[PDB]
């Protein structure tokens, strides 16, 4: 009952920030560039150092022209607007944002541990306690996001960072949508799509609980439950024959049968008791939910701290950051 009050205040605060977003809280020459951490079809992520403070940040730089070319205006504006409005322990925080003639900039605290994806592929698979520790953080994060009527729709190890305490930071919010009924976009990453996203019928927040099932499976097995060479073939397998590795525990298989439940009216997380069917499942019996939320549980894995180290990121050709003399796509990004 005290949970209802906490989340009611959280929704009020979210909606106030959504309605009056922060804008223009730094500028590019406040930062020194150190290294490219990632590239994508319309932007880059840079390790930068704030000149005045010496603090390290991940700066996500989006090329406005490429965003427009690739039809990502609404998603990019949405990511920034969501990020500055949400507040939860396992969500990255937006420290600054601004724009110039060429680019949009979002500046987050640097997390040198990098992505869950790279740790998972290095180790192979996580033990069940290890996977459970991460899963519990996702469960709580979705309880929070769903209370705001947001569907997350972008869960995968690629969008999950491991911080210096060994806890999760969820990175990406372009796809997060307010949905109290149904929505219909074919949106997400193939291996993680619920059957009702692939099919033309509408879907709701239950797709996030399906995706949690996929994540737990991939964390525990080392590979996702439905895989193939091309997306169309992944979709066909999804639409529910799952096989479990023999090392999966009885409790883990039972949980996954109820999360990877094709019938969304039978899927855990989407029943009358909502998230509590998940929290009370036997696989989570050893999980101290409050202690996880408070980050008082000893993490199973702490990324080695090497001192601005980028050992957990790949190397990229370092290319210019060019700011045109002409303003590009001003009207489209006015609200950023």
């Amino acid at each position: 009952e005290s949970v209802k009050e906490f989340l009611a205040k959280a929704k009020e605060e979210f909606l106030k920030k959504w309605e009056s977003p922060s804008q223009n809280t730094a500028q590019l020459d406040h930062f020194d560039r150190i290294k490219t951490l990632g590239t994508g079809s319309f932007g880059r992520v840079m390790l930068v150092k704030h000149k005045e403070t010496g603090n390290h940040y991940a700066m996500k730089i989006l090329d406005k022209q490429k965003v427009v070319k690739l039809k990502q205006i609404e998603h990019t504006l949405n990511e920034k607007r969501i990020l500055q409005a949400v507040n939860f322990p396992f969500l990255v925080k937006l420290e600054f944002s601004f724009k110039d003639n060429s680019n949009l900039y979002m500046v987050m605290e640097y997390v040198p541990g990098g992505e869950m994806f790279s740790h998972l592929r290095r180790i192979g698979r996580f033990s069940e306690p290890h996977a459970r520790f991460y899963a519990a953080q996702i469960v709580l994060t979705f309880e929070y996001l769903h209370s705001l009527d947001l569907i997350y729709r972008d869960l995968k190890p690629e969008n999950l960072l491991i911080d210096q305490q060994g806890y999760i930071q969820v990175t990406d919010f372009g796809f997060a949508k307010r949905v109290k009924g149904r929505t219909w976009t074919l949106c997400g990453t193939p291996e993680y799509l619920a059957p009702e996203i692939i099919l033309s019928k509408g879907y709701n927040k239950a797709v996030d609980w399906w995706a949690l099932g996929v994540l737990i499976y991939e964390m525990a097995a080392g590979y996702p439950p439905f895989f193939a060479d091309q997306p169309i073939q992944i979709y066909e397998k999804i639409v529910g024959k799952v096989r479990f590795p023999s090392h999966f525990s009885s409790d883990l298989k039972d949980l996954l049968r109820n999360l990877l439940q094709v019938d969304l009216t039978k899927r855990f997380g989407n029943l009358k008791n909502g998230v509590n069917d998940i929290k009370n499942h036997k696989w989570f019996a050893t999980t101290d939910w409050i202690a996880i939320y408070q980050r008082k549980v000893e993490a199973p894995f702490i990324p080695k701290f090497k001192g601005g180290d980028t050992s957990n990121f790949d190397d990229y050709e370092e290319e210019e950051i060019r700011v045109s003399i002409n303003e590009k796509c001003g009207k489209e990004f006015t609200e950023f």
């Binding site: 994806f117 592929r121 995968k156 690629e158 997400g188 990453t189 996702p224 895989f227």
Partner: peptide, 18 residues
């Protein structure tokens, strides 16, 4: 093995949205 089939036929690297 299933893992071998994942390496042979699955997508083992970082996965794009769409």
């Amino acid at each position: 093995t299933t893992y071998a089939d994942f390496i042979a036929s699955g997508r083992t690297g970082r996965r794009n949205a769409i």
